[PDB]
Structure 1
């Protein structure tokens, strides 16, 4: 189904979906590397109760890269220069109750650009949903320790001020990596990140790095002053 087509206005209206969907399709005429500040927010609202927030002002690039990791990748077309498919459930669709509805909003758009939303529904229903969280490391701190237990993927902002990044595994061993080593390990699993319209392919962005977290309980980052490091994590859980 078709949800909305946004152009001209810098902010999108709160779009309400009553049909149980399972995935979202983002289409735009700008390249993946051209996204600067577009943000998305998706949440399921109940009736006489409290809302459930899956994404709260998450960057469009991070949202796209957190759902197209693996065999699949963001594609292109003659009309749309960027098409991405993002999963919201594990293997089915969201099971809506008597008074639930999905609500999607977009923030910080561009006046002379177009963005189209599509919904994908499948017969299977499931309760496992994806939750997105954000973590920040300031430009003044030297060493920062963060907890990533229970997560399976992460996206980190790439900068030249980052020196070392050390994992903490479930068995207690600690392994330290360089940014180049982390990038090589990331590209070892997913060689192609996106395909352009003319035919060229890109293996990754120049400012975002995807880290697959398997049996990782903590990450310690050592860097210097100058930039703020952003981490976006995704988890799967039952509501």
Structure 2
């Protein structure tokens, strides 16, 4: 069902959903490439316990790209320049116990734009949920190793100062990759990334890269100074 419509304000109010949903539809008149600083934060609140945080100030571009990788792609309409569907659980929907609800907030919005939220319910309830985490490589340092065991998808910020990537697999084999090779490998699973309103397609953003991780237990990044690199990693687990 329709959740909220935000316009004319920089910060969206705390939105509460008491109905068990399975996915969220984000629709806005801002094109996906034009999104700059919008952030989202979704979690599950319990009456007599600690909250369960699924996302925490995740960038809208990273959230959309992580949630729409595969056969699907973000679409458009005559009135909305961006429509995306992002699922919060595998197969079924989220099971809500007593005194349990869902809370969604939006931050860093543009004054003269529009945003909408829609909730998508399912005929089933499941215990598996999606979590989003962030890993940063600082600008001052040169190389860094980050452990991505248990994750199945990552989003890299694309920059020209990054030179080398290293993948360590489960069987201990280490493979060397370049940004060009990584982009070409990524575009062999989901060729088209988005469809524009006028009819043209875009096969990938110029500042984000979607890395599918299978049997990967580590990522080493070799770069130079002057820029900060960010990874948005997605995982599935039972709460």
Which bin holds the TM-score, normalised by the shorter protein? over 0.9
- Distance in 2 between residues matched to 1:130 and 1:47, nearest whole Å: 21
Q: CA deviation at 1:119?
A: 0.2
Superposed CA deviations along residues 8-34 of structure 1, whole A, max 9, x for unmatched, are: 000000000000000000000010000
Q: Distance in 2 between matches of 1:16 and 1:89?
A: 18
CA distance in 1, matches of 2:184, 2:76: 25
1:226 Cα deviation after fit? 1.2
1:61-89 deviation line (CA, Å, top 9, x unaligned): 00000000000000000000000000000
**How far apart are residue 117 of structure 1 and its match?**
0.2
Q: Distance in 2 between matches of 1:227 and 1:192?
A: 28
Deviation of 1:147 after TM superposition, in Å, equals 0.3
The 2-side partners of 1:146 and 1:176 are apart by 15
Rounded Cα–Cα distance in structure 1 between residues aligned with 2:30 and 2:40? 16
Distance 1:62 1:81 in 2: 18
Distance 1:65 1:210 in 2: 7
What is the CA distance between 1:137 and its match in structure 2? 0.4
Structure 1's unaligned 5+ residue stretches are: none
Deviation at 1:181, TM superposition (A): 0.1
Q: Which runs of 4+ in 1 moved over 6 A?
A: none
SS of equivalent residue, structure 2 residue 67: coil
Deviation at 1:188, TM superposition (A): 0.6
Match of 2:168 in 1: 168
**1:109 is paired with a residue of what secondary structure?**
coil
Q: Deviations over 1:121-162 (max 9, x none)?
A: 011110100000000001111110000000000000000000
Q: Per-residue CA shift, 1:157-182, capped at 9, x if unaligned?
A: 00000000000000000001000000
TM-score, L = length of structure 2: 1.00
Deviation at 1:103?
0.1
**Alignment partner, residue 181 of structure 2:** 181
Q: For 2:213, what is the secondary structure of its paired residue?
A: coil
- SS state of the match for residue 11, structure 1? coil
Partners of 2:136 and 2:143 in 1: how far apart? 12
Give me the whole-angstrom Cα distance separating, in 2, the residues matched to 1:226 and 1:183.
22
2:32 pairs with 1:40:
no
- Describe the SS at the equivalent of 1:149: coil
CA RMSD between the two structures: 0.3
